[model samples]
Target: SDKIIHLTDDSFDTDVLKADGAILVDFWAEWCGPCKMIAPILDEIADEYQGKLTVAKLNIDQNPGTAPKYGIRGIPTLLLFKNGEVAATKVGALSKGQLKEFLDANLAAALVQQLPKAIIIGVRKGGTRALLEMLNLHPAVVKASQEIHFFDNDENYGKGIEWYRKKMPFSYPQQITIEKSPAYFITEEVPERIYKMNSSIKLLIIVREPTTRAISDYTQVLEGKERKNKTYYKFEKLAIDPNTCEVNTKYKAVRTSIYTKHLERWLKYFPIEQFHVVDGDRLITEPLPELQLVEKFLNLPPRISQYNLYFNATRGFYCLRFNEIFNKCLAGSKGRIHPEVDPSVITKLRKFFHPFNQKFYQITGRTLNWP
Candidate 1:
């Protein structure tokens, strides 16, 4: 479906060496037998790895200057170039799948790193990592391996957007690069700053059931305190004002759960229509339907399907399917066992959150079935 490019010695720098991503250069000659063996495989690789890789051919007879520069004495020499240098080199012809194995082994984490076209502005403990890992399954989506925290932290932003972009994922230009900094949703200055960077950026917000989310947020804090051999207050004690026995407005977890408060702050910079609210609870169980909504919102093709997910009973969550040989469940800090909370506190927090949740549903034009 794609043509393998031919490179002359003069054009090699402009084409392969200085290429943005990886370029596999085949040093072959018309009179060689093994070169003929590898030609069709290279053509197919160019077709399949279209966006992520570049495939080029250079004949030694026609491009003698280029072959000797890289110390190539073999007729069927293969060199993988990245960022104006040779990253990998191989000699002789190879099998169909074997050459791809050569490319894959050399280019495991290959591609150019760039800023995201879409951002998952987050709610901490609201399944942000879960959402990101799953979104990475989509063919059009490529995500940064870690949260860049570029917009949320003033110190991080001071380094400039260039530094921020460098922290993003390696991706082809055609792929939508997504970065999630959950703290971005709650930070007061994040919305305006993000708008200044890209006014038309697609925003994804993943939120959990409000009352549960606050407690989960508190649990994160509680666990951190335990690691340092320190004691912490229970979720109820932390979230409720001891004097008034009312929901504590100063408590960070409870305050963050007032979803409409944060949404309106962001709304000051971006329209409500620009936001796509993901129900994290629904996503854990009915992932395909939830993902399609985001796919529709981001205007991505409906390539992600039910087939990409399977239930994991031990994790009690969904494991992602990239292919037959590659399957993994989201692990690490996620799926943490939550501490029990007073039933009354959960109900009170839910009641406190009812109006905000209602407003959130209205603004997003989607009910999350949150009671």
Candidate 2:
């Protein structure tokens, strides 16, 4: 029913910020009437500039955790971003003509300047790979080829945007472009960097069960595909005796599972509307509706397709360019753990995630009725 590009917290940079043409980002909420007043105008603009400019909306109520990150206390704060910077901001509702006029005035000079839409801060094994993979396939989205670890370590910070862009894949000056590095989610310093460059920029985040994510993180490290310094089965011996494993402490295995605390820090900086969290489990079981949610958030050119449901086990999601042969080759060594989780550990794992669930709901202002 919508032809808008709705992005979750994860795709803000790639979808809205880096999109071709002028962009009108309306940060609003469902409960706000003033937002409702602006909706028709946004829709009309979106329809009118179907191919030229991108008219997107972000709801603050549904995404409370993300909205406050950007200090947005109002319902209809329209931000106009051009050439990767916040060109201008409109704090209230306006008519269609006003919207057009503002865009024309704000982006009049830098219409041709090329810049990435946004930077994706990702937590590894948190369904980031899936999100990045799927969006990369969009004709309008240009994404990076590999994960860039900019925020995780200080070493990469000195590298300029050119080098940073090189580390990630480049979009072909398409309708939208993106750069995704899983480290951005947990790193505390990145928002300032983003703010220093383009403070009004949007942010995206996708979250999964904490315990499951930790295991997956460990698995990737074991496979040598993620962390080379770590070896396979290093944690297996630790798992045999969970109590004993804690004392050795060098491995730092269990701490990765807690997500709420980390997410709360992000909330403090970005407005709840600017940041968003999705149920990773739902994203896998049903990707379209979830993506539809993202499209609405981003207010992108909406055209949903059943074709996007296709999943590649090797890639684990729709897009990572998975080749079964390559995956099979990678699996030959002990370093490669089976992607599937052992059913026996499910109960034990659930125990570790329960607290995270509680804290997560607290921070996000919602609850997860788990079984």
Candidate 3:
């Protein structure tokens, strides 16, 4: 089970520096007891992590030129290399536990921060959590736990790209990193900002029926006001202009539902091919299929399967099945009961979104059955 690479001075640069993923190289000599002490642990690491990490052994005696290059004042220095650069270094004989954590923490950092190749630009309450959680079931997909609103918030953007990079999740060389920030969808500056990062970056926009989504959005905000005993205008008052009795474009929630207005801003920066529209309603009822589409969009091998999900009748939601022993369900925050709004107000909102929805469909080249 112990699989380790034995490298000499001649092979050091070619093998370690020029490697694809992270390589943990050990600098040791034959006479040192400490090097001998951790030799087995190195072998265990090699055996344990194959594709994700690589283990290499450099005999300092044989590899004389390479040692001085790295300034090896001591034996048993473990150096982690990524993209032909040193990511982390440790000098001394480390316990198996120490070595394990060392490897864990370093690969987990700058030693570098991985920028997201894919992002979830949002329609809030459109099931982004479900989309993110379900996509992460694939072994190759890792996600940032919180929304990193680097692109949307001007203050966050001014913090520099390094600050943004620091927010990404740790992943293996082959894995893709994803982050979701719903606010990015409506922010006018975001499309240009994201284009500056990478023009080809994949964009995922999960949306439910527009009227339904706006109602959902309003209901969420309403609940917050109610919790603190703060008074707020009802949906009818906020959505319909009293003077004209027409749908009010002034309401923030109503404006967010007019998808094409916001999407048009992004179209100016990125190609239609770069975007993928995910159906939020279908994802809850049938996660596997929607996730499969995401897999293809990200150019990932189809790894998510039906066995990874199961229906929980009690919760009236689909729960995740990580493996035989591990399973998790969305926290109780989801599936919250929505407040009843005036049906006439909803109809007005729906009719107002009809033309915009039609434009969104035509531009994206995918037909969404939204009336």
Candidate 4:
């Protein structure tokens, strides 16, 4: 079986940029004899790495745009790219053993970066970010610096697993690495992609009441004010038909709130046990208890407890304690006070979400008891 993928300027973005891990792009000319000699060796590396690395060939004679961009001055230039950046460039050809040694030296770190033990996937505005921050309080959990978005974003996914892994906070072997991209839960493609990365990968989902979550989702996008707000459909316009109980499934804000619809997609790829749902509301009012459950589900030590938390009277939410002396509260964007709306709107949302909530409960075999 052939593992080497033929790359051209047209497929560069999809094959290399959108690819999920380490990439070895061999630039060669048909006229070169050494190019032919090392071809089998490159194929072996592709087979060896398989899911961990992507191996591609770029014929410089046929695809002129890419070769010059990277200054390919010679034939059979082997460029090893990690996360879309040139990691190592080898001129001419080498034996299989020599190539493996070169790759091993450069790629050991990359392999470690690809595999995260846990991921916070799904339900935007469902307190996923807040949960990640809270969970990171545990000594055994090392949080990612930002939302790596490897699964949801095609461009980032293309940059590969190594890129995603490098963004993770460093940790010991026993410590867990976690990355959160709220969008991954809702995106259709994410579940399967994450499964492909590591089938046993643990998933954490924090869910809020659909009605409130939809409103919060709208509020976050409204951060830029008037002009940006115009780009988004008004809450009432997107959520439901006031006259009838009909929902607007076409609107992302409305569709995303249908938790059962998205969860079903994830279930197709991952077993129910791999997923752990955190009550977003409980995490707000009674955080420590919820986190205790989370720590247990993650098989983490009982490092987090009530002692690791304090309530901020001014902010009116729980804050994580750095130690006995200090506490860490989320930024203003989090725990936002829900904007006031008509009582009639609240009634309609409750009625609308009731059936969906029931379905979600049935599917997950767990209930949030949304009010």
Candidate 5:
């Protein structure tokens, strides 16, 4: 069982207000029905995100000083604190998905006025890195450092124009600046912000099979410095135990980050022309040509055609060309492009993601190969 930190009046400021890493504090009184409604969800979050974040409950009835300090006229309020300030306050009974969305919004920035731009929201671990790499190859295109996170950061609020600019590298200020924070699409605000900035502001999304993408994401997260000790490798336990779920149940972990919800948000705010989604699987099967098609969509020059293709059966990348085998030649090794993921997990993930994929296709007007 993960430890649940209970906050008292004496500990509210020090334990919550001054805390870091996107703290969520549930302020409740025992007699409140709504508060009770939200408590179970909070407990689920605590166990799921045991090591990643701090989740605490503050009893307003008991912590009278803390409750009044924040002007608590109501019970069952979830206050999201970031940078020692209240980022968002929620006063209602929200399901797990709704709660996840709320927290994502608090972490994200609001839209600001800016020039027309586009972003490559993620299809999980699918070709996002390669897309950024290819786009970086363009003299006119610049990729932000890892995740520009403009959409998620509040500092970019109301300055969507400036926020878009922040993602550009110093060399190309006048070019079509874009951000590729795969994370942007997972939250609801991104598409709407893009629309408000400019309805024509193009948006690109990638989709890979849920199983492959999820496993890849799991591995990537596990390999990261922060998640090095996370349970990705503990497939047996993590797969079955929803207990460790921080944001979403482990059963739906991979599909949870799909572009469907994000794209729906985009569709609600902008026309279909402004949004483009691609199969990450195709990017692997045909790298250059695949990118060519995407380039055409972005209105980049024809000279954008250039690529390197050397295929190994094991490379974990999207696109590569088959090179001649040289068993007798000098030894050579390249890191496996697509590492093998657990087959059983992959099978299970596919069944779970089928409905979402179909709905996503219906919403986007394009069929998918997630099957």
Candidate 6:
């Protein structure tokens, strides 16, 4: 499935030391019995750890300069290089499984730290994206490039898990990987798909004021595309059928706001305790307190503090700045005020969401006090 390249002094620098991720250079000789025994093992590791590792072999007798330069006096020596430096080394030959154990014990911490220990699978307009940015301020959290909708979109999910793993940012050993795709909350198949990937994966959800969140959802859709006839649907009309008194299943804007309905589906796959829900309103007003709660849920050490944030009066939001130099804030698309709807329609939505909101609080064991 993968090939182990034969390296020489001529190509050593370009091929091994300068490689991007991790490279294993096996120092062996033709007459060494143990070296021959481990050759197939190294090849298999190259295949198994394809994206995370590179395997190369160098015959000591043939590549005198390179083996001697690394002070390799023993036969069957393996040097693991990461980011152009030796990160690990092994002496003598070992079985294939044991060799894999060696690589796993040595390389996994650094590599999978880039993989999400927790994913924010949630409500689209509930400020989860902002929470992702806030969490990245912690030294132990590594951020993804953007929302990678691997679980929600069937086309992307078919690309396979390895394809998904490659999307994470490289992180240090102790750090954790995190990603968010707000659409994952309501996509019926996503819970089972994510469970199949990592059964114990921690989940984070943000719940905003139901009325505000629904309006924001509609705003995003309106900004996306108008009807073929060139008009927009009224928020109340799309959000509810006036006679049914039930959420409009046909419209995502309404269905996504029914928190308990979706949470019940997710709970079937994940235990209730595995989820950490943030009150979106509090995350905006008192971010540090909300973040500290999240840190505890993830078992991370105290890293973020009130010092990491500042309220920008101009933007009317809390912004992130760190170490007196680095600065980050949500994109301009955030903080858009909901367009005015008829007061009577607002009353109807409030009445409709009251029961759902109560059940959500009951399930999460936290009071939301949504308007």
lDDT of each: 0.82, 0.60, 0.84, 0.78, 0.62, 0.82
Which window of 10 residues has the lowest lDDT sum in candidate 5?
326-335
Q: Write the per-residue lDDT of candidate 1 for residues 318-347, one digit (tens) a residue.
A: 989876588988875777788888888888
Off by over 4 Å in 4: 1-114, 227-234, 242-245
Q: Candidate 2 regions off by >4 Å?
A: 1-113, 161-174, 225-253, 311-346, 365-371
lDDT of 4 at 257: 85
- Ordered from best to worst TM-score, the candidate numbers read 1, 3, 6, 4, 2, 5
For model 5, residues 29-142, the per-residue Cα lDDT tens digits are 879998877778887776554323457788877778877767778777788887588878887778999887776566533323334366787754666666666654433454
Candidate 2: tens digits of C-alpha lDDT, residues 1-371: 35466656666778766665566778877777878887887777776554346666666655556556667777689877665667788878778788788766765432232345655565566666567665544445655657666656678778765666556443333355556676766677876666665555556566666655666667766666444554456444544356742222233455545666567766666676675566676766677776676666555545556644565566454433222222211122212344655555556657656877787777765554443
Better of 4 and 6 by TM-score: 6
> In model 3, where is the ten-residue run with the lowest total lDDT?
104-113
TM-score of each: 0.73, 0.57, 0.72, 0.66, 0.54, 0.68
Clashing pairs in 6: 116-177
lDDT of 4 by residue, 1-371 (tens): 24467889999877777654567888888899999988877766765654345678988889889988888888888888765677897877788887888887777543243357888886788887789888887655778858877888899889988777777765544457888888887788888888998999999888988888888987777665754545645677666665665666676777888888888899998999998888888888888888898887887545566777778898898888765466678888886666676677777777878999999888777789987
Give per-residue CA lDDT, model 3, range 17-75, as digits (tens).
77666789888888999888888787777756644677889888876888888788988
Model 6 lDDT-worst window of ten: 106-115
Give the alpha carbon lDDT tens digit for every residue of 1-371 in model 6: 12566788998887877655667888888899988887777766765664466678888788799877878889889899987899989888778877888888878554553468999988788888889999987656877859889998999999999889888888765567889899899888999999998999999999888878889988877766653436687787787676876556577777788889999999999999999999899999989999999998998645587788999988999999865577877887898766898777778778878998999999999998987
